[PDB]
Amino acid sequence: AFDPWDPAFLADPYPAYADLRAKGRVHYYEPTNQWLVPHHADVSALLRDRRLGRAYQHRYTHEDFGRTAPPAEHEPFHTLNDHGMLDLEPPDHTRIRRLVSKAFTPRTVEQLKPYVAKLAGELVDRLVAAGGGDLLADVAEPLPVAVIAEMLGIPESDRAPLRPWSADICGMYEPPKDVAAKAVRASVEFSDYLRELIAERRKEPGDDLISGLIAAHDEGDRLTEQEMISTCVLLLNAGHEATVNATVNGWYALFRNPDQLAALRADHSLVPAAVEELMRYDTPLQLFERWVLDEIEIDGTTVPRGAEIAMLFGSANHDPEVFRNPEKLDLTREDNPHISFSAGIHYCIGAPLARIELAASMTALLEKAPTLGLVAEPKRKPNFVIRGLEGLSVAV
Numbered sequence: 372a373f374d375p376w377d378p379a380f381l382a383d384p385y386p387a388y389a390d391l392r393a394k395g396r397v398h399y400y401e402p403t404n405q406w407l408v409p410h411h412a413d414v415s416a417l418l419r420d421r422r423l424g425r426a427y428q429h430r431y432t433h434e435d436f437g438r439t440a441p442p443a444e445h446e447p448f449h450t451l452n453d454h455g456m457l458d459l460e461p462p463d464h465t466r467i468r469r470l471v472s473k474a475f476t477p478r479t480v481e482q483l484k485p486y487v488a489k490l491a492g493e494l495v496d497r498l499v500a501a502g503g504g505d506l507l508a509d510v511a512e513p514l515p516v517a518v519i520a521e522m523l524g525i526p527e528s529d530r531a532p533l534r535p536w537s538a539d540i541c542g543m544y545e546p547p548k549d550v551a552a553k554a555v556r557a558s559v560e561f562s563d564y565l566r567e568l569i570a571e572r573r574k575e576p577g578d579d580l581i582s583g584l585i586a587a588h589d590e591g592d593r594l595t596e597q598e599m600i601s602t603c604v605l606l607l608n609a610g611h612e613a614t615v616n617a618t619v620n621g622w623y624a625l626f627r628n629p630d631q632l633a634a635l636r637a638d639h640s641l642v643p644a645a646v647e648e649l650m651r652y653d654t655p656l657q658l659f660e661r662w663v664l665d666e667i668e669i670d671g672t673t674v675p676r677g678a679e680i681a682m683l684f685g686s687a688n689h690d691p692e693v694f695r696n697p698e699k700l701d702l703t704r705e706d707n708p709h710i711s712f713s714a715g716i717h718y719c720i721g722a723p724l725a726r727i728e729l730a731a732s733m734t735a736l737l738e739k740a741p742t743l744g745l746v747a748e749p750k751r752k753p754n755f756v757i758r759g760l761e762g763l764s765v766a767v
């Protein structure tokens with residue numbers, strides 16, 4: 372009896388998650404032909420199970436897996452997608468991630484802190500100067516793209532087309548004939564830009580990540596041109612909308628919980644714990660899927676090879692067997708093992724950088740806009756897999 376399109380579910384899905392959890396540990400959903408998993412223990416376990424993957428073609432033809440191959444007109448998208456580590460399974464995943472993690476390191480993250488803090492400060496100053504604005508458009512949206520641009524080493528000169536590129540490519544996962552068109556178009560355009568920067572970095576080495584990707588090697592193993600383009604597009608696409616919606620989701624929760632906002636404003640040392648609790652309370656990434664590569668059993672229920680599982684991260688983050696009073700926002704929550712950055716081999720390689728951007732944004736807002744208030748009830752985007760608002764009207 373579940374309709375993820377119901378406007379009440381889009382407004383507040385957490386009561387329905389409560390019902391799902393109470394009704395069982397795996398539920399077949401005919402409309403999407405998917406098996407829904409809502410408990411934290413099950414989601415955690417399945418993300419670490421070697422019998423599940425974000426791809427199946429390394430093991431089975433589409434046809435042997437009981438599926439239909441995608442249009443060859445979408446080859447440029449599928450090529451760019453299938454060389455990024457998010458949709459790779461071992462041993463290809465292992466190789467590209469071991470290689471990428473030689474260029475993209477803890478030192479790389481540390482080096483961005485000053486630019487993250489600087490940029491955050493500037494953004495909030497401008498909003499303060501205007502005495503208010505749209506937290507999404509003016510503060511949340513600009514920072515993530517800029518940080519990845521900076522890490523990749525791209526001029527503010529040519530940084531304009533990145534958002535619209537990332538937008539149209541991601542449109543493919545949201546699929547209209549028109550969406551598909553721009554998505555392949557952007558996939559080509561963006562990949563050519565990358566292709567270019569890859570060479571003027573080969574004949575002209577730099578200190579950026581594109582240059583660290585060109586250098587990265589191990590056991591004489593190295594990255595292909597496509598693996599590098601795919602990695603760069605993945606880092607922008609993965610590090611943008613999630614970070615944006617965590618900042619706006621967080622501030623909306625803070626405005627709706629004035630006791631917690633006042634606690635935060637009174638003790639800025641809560642910022643790290645606050646970033647984590649606001650993500651558990653209302654994660655922007657509600658849902659992730661896995662193919663069943665070998666038959667599994669969940670709670671004595673057999674899920675067959677060829678099935679697709681939907682992991683409800685939102686449900687898992689409100690599981691009362693893990694969190695006490697999960698429906699309550701508590702920035703001082705001691706016990707917060709939220710799964711928002713996932714688990715197993717696809718565990719977010721960006722999580723340290725994401726946490727530095729969310730902390731820098733929050734600290735700037737608290738220091739520079741300590742009187743910030745919500746002007747209007749925001750409009751919720753009609754989407755149950757990426758949970759977000761159209762914008763956030765604020766005033767000092």
Ligand code: HEM
Nearest residue numbers: 456457609610613614617659712713716717719720721725
């Ligand atoms: C609020 C911020 C973020 C959240 C909640 C988030 C969450 C996640 C999740 C859940 C996954 C795995 C999905 C799955 O298991 O199916 C993932 C993967 C990934 N994330 Fe993030 N992420 C965030 C920010 C970022 C940032 C800033 C970057 C990069 C700069 C990034 C890069 C990636 C990459 C490259 C992967 C693929 C990892 C792999 O497949 O091995 N993410 N992220």
